Design a protein around this ligand. Sequence first.
Ligand SMILES: Cc1cc2nc3c(=O)[nH]c(=O)nc-3n(C[C@H](O)[C@H](O)[C@H](O)COP(=O)(O)O)c2cc1C
Ligand code: SF4
Ligand code: SF4
Ligand code: SF4
Ligand code: SF4
Ligand code: SF4
Ligand code: FES
Ligand code: FES
Ligand SMILES: [Ca+2]
Lengths: 225, 439, 156, 120, 226
Amino acid sequence: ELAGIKDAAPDATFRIRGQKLAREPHRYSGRTAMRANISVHEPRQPQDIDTMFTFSMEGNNQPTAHRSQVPFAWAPGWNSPQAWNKFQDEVGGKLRFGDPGVRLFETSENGLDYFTSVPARFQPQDGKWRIAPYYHLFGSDELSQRAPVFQSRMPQPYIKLNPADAAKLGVNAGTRVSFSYDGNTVTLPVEIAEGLTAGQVGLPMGMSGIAPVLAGAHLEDLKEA
Amino acid sequence: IIRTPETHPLTWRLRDDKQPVWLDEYRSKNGYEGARKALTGLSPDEIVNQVKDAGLKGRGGAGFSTGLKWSLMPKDESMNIRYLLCNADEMEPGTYKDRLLMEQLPHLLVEGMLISAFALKAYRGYIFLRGEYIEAAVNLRRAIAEATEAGLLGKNIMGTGFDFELFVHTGAGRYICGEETALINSLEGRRANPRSKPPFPATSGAWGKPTCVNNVETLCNVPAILANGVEWYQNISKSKDAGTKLMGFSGRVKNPGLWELPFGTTAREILEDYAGGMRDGLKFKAWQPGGAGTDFLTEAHLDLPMEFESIGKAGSRLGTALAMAVDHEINMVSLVRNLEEFFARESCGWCTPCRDGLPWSVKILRALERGEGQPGDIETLEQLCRFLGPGKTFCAHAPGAVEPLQSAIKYFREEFEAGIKQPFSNTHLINGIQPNLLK
Amino acid sequence: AFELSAAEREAIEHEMHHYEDPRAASIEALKIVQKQRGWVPDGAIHAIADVLGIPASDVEGVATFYSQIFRQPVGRHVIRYCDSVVCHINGYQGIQAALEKKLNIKPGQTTFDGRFTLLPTCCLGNCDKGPNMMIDEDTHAHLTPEAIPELLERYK
Amino acid sequence: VACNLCAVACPVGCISLQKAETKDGRWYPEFFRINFSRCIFCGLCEEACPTTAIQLTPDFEMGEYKRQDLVYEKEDLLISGPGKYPEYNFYRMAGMAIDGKDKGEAENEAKPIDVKSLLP
Amino acid sequence: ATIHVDGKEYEVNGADNLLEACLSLGLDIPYFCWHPALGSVGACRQCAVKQYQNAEDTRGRLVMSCMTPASDGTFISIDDEEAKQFRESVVEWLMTNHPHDCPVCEEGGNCHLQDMTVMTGHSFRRYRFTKRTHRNQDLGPFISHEMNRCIACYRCVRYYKDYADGTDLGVYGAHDNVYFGRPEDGTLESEFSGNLVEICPTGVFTDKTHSERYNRKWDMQFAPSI
Ligand SMILES: Cc1cc2nc3c(=O)[nH]c(=O)nc-3n(C[C@H](O)[C@H](O)[C@H](O)COP(=O)(O)O)c2cc1C
Ligand code: SF4
Ligand code: SF4
Ligand code: SF4
Ligand code: SF4
Ligand code: SF4
Ligand code: FES
Ligand code: FES
Ligand SMILES: [Ca+2]
């Protein structure tokens, strides 16, 4: 099934007229002084036997090179991101020699059949709160939330409640409520979400201490802390 | 000076006490007769053809014929939504005509609205005003309400099944709103940046619908053509440009006013026989034929007919035909500095040459006024004048902006050379670097 | 904090009934707020944006694009004098000097009591009777420098 | 100002530095090292410096015992005076706002006109 | 379609404008305001070429290649003397207010205006008057704002409003006091606000995360990745 990945990128023996592809621009600087604080002896340049790129400027990055992988856009006279116009066959279209990436599967001729599993309508039962997922672009991802720059853009950990459910619980906007899931009692402050359907409660998936697997689960013993 | 209706179709119903003409007085003096004829006996395309072969031209300054512009409307019946706009901005300096027709004769404008909106099949009409004409706004709104309660505005106008609605949109004081595409953009509530052509406003104008933008003077000229006929309108003046026009002189003259004359009247008659000549102790130096956005002309150009072709052959524009006279007591550098400061501070900021070259010429002329000119100054001014003409900029505000500068440079270069006193010094010295002394 | 009045909101709705798009009432809404409060405060942009359904960015751009919409507080009267070409020919400079001598302020500033705010303006359309001045809703023609303090004493 | 023009203009590549910013926003090099065992004293860095910060004094006695001591860090490069150019200041010409220099306070810079100003 | 650039015949797509058709052929035409993903508005007036009516036409007319359709049998010239002078003049007019900030700017070495001034051959300055300045805004922890370095090319407003449908950034001001930014200090609300660091041809919008540990583009070891 994974036979397509052979055509994703050419192997490490791929050369453009005998030479490799450069990683850094040809005017890379400081080559004899980046490592001078450790030792004055110039070390071996790192050898990249895995791929067709090299860890130096001794390579090919011409706009007319027959390849699909471009490390960066640079043309003589075009040092801006507008060098991609020189790196395309036509401006605004595809790359000059085809875009990288290969489809793993084609479209099947015959499709599936109709799924008869029609679910019943949602019934808000007492004492159990269904988890509505509120994803955020900054925070839901496992790796992006660890970025210290994202913490300023990170929203505060907030739990969303219907006005009717908030009135039933007697809680306002901003007050702290505590809920337990899988023997883990955590406390969060409350926003009031008008469009949320009653009997649910809204949680931000991917937060610190809140798993994204909680979507669609039920919440017990939600109460004001 | 008597004003018979045969030779003064626009201003023969004026009142001597500077009071507006209301609905009963307008209808007593043959009012809404062309409106009645056009709505009863004439098809809209017949009225468009009559305006086309009557030789009526636009009075906003472009000189474009209105019949040809009305013929650019789409013939598709699926787009029945249509808009007709009046450029009642009148923000060009030296222009005071539209204030005169639309402060004390609003029913003529209303009748022109009705006739042109029926001919264009326009279901709505707007008058894009300016914020500084309060009395004109009050008179237009009162006349519109009076025409509404008299059955001439609204649904089923005079039993013809044509529904037309008229609105007044008071502007907020920006000169670029006088441009027709920018007028449309300001009508929609956006920043008044103009639009590129093609597409024209006729194909897709206000809110994407077919739209016709016309001056106050042209829409006032229309009901006279519809009432007194077309062959009468062609026989008003024996010139290429037919019909009467509001022309007049202003600025240090005995009688700075405004008159209605047939086309082809030479500029000395409007200066001496009507404005009384220049004032006591002031001799003639120059004159602008169209106001702030035209080329200056000398004494020898005073015996020239005020037509589009004659002034265009002379190297200028007729414009609004409201000439301003400059005596010798006013320095040309100061006057051009004031003109360029107005044009630089009324730029819309869309396209680079006008936006970042008019302030440069402003600073150069301000340095010339105080006598701080440097070598290479007039060269920079004529460089800017060459590279701000038609086609280079997005709209025609910048050609009209650099027209007076190049005209005063061509005709009065000795006054600009007097301000060049300082030697050229762009770079201050740096201790430890020998300068590159260019020869 | 800025809260729109009921009369302001009613006038804005009646104005946006006239156009097919609610964005077209932005200039008239800003002018209505300007007429009611002298100038356009910071929360007025958000209020007009929430009423009209258009974002506050283009409302602020419209309010800053047009010179007759004031985004800074002004005095009880706005004296606008025509600095254009014909009034320069007719000599508006003496009128401006008389105004600066009476008000003791430069153009673009307001008096310390909030009475007058002096501003140059565009062509007022009265070039045949120039020079011309424009206090809040009244224009004046054939101005002389000696008649300026007599003219300005009828505005409290 | 740690603009890295000297490092790229150096044909031997014996310059390394890193840009850092203070609280006010001015730019300085976090570190700065020259490999004098590699430098050919070609003077291209001083020619390419847009602030005239780096200069070549008339001093030649730079012999050394070990090659590790030929790498001159920022402690051995910053001197107490302006060197061969006594009165130049890049921040007087620069358009960026720093401590003690507001917007419009540089050479040939007008005061910032606000978009809310009542003047047309 | 068939075009003739400097007397040389080329075959191009007839629907596209002259700017992208000529940039597809490798010809070098200056441009600021036009973007391949945003369309033509004809703002910067930098893309001027000299179009002739027919083959035996010598006068011509200065048009903008981004708003000129690449119709069949078009005759244009790129390196005409008047066209080159006008393009250098447009660069100079953009240079009358650009601050002396290139050593202390993050877009140095990656600046479209730098490459575009060097490409047009403009190197001599004859502007001796003052330069306008603008106060900056706090545009959140990602985008750093420096309004002095703007050239009013209207790319940011066009992308952020027409393309990304963002509502908190726009253009204000007037004739030469145009201000591109938020109406008040605050974080940019759109989820596609990062593309302003390359949509902007100058260093008005800069990557503040990169601006912390900044180094120039020639010092970057790059790689393609996902
Ligand atoms: C900068 C500029 C300002 C203009 N101002 C006006 C104006 O105030 N009134 C007007 O009728 N036309 C004005 N025009 C001309 C319009 O573009 C257009 O000719 C007019 O709206 C209708 O033309 P018409 O006379 O054929 O009806 C202006 C044009 C430009 C370029
Ligand atoms: S010439 Fe350009 S910047 Fe000037 S007013 Fe017209 S479109 Fe606006
Ligand atoms: S003088 Fe030395 S440090 Fe300077 S550019 Fe030349 S080799 Fe590099
Ligand atoms: S020494 Fe000069 S050239 Fe080198 S980074 Fe500093 S300012 Fe730039
Ligand atoms: S901020 Fe950048 S993208 Fe926006 S108009 Fe200015 S130069 Fe263009
Ligand atoms: S954005 Fe301005 S300061 Fe930065 S490199 Fe470009 S021209 Fe220089
Ligand atoms: S020039 Fe002042 S009123 Fe027209
Ligand atoms: S690229 Fe054509 S005018 Fe901007
Ligand atoms: Ca590897």
